[PDB]
Amino acid sequence: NGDPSTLERMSRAVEQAAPWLILAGSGGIADVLAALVGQPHLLVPQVTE
């Protein structure tokens, strides 16, 4: 359940090819990211909102 800023940080980690692990019920960012990455949609700014 990191801050929204952590998202950008995690972005920086993706290019570094570092294995990531998330917890479903830890908190908000984690729980939402669980679903978000589940279904790939090109543009979902309203869904993400």
């Binding site: 589940g38 279904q39 309203q46 869904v47």
Partner: protein
């Protein structure tokens, strides 16, 4: 002979064997059904909005 057979067919270990076989069949069947269920559920939930 019929009595010997009846006593054998009601032997405790034989009951366990029969139950194990039926449970295996139920497990395979229910597992297939469950596997189909989540696959359908993801496709149905993706169309959320």
């Amino acid at each position: 002979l019929s009595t010997m057979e009846k006593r054998r067919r009601d032997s405790e270990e034989e009951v366990l064997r029969k139950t194990a076989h039926r449970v295996d069949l139920i497990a395979k069947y229910i597992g297939g059904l469950r596997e189909q269920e989540k696959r359908i559920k993801c496709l149905e939930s993706q169309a959320n909005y």
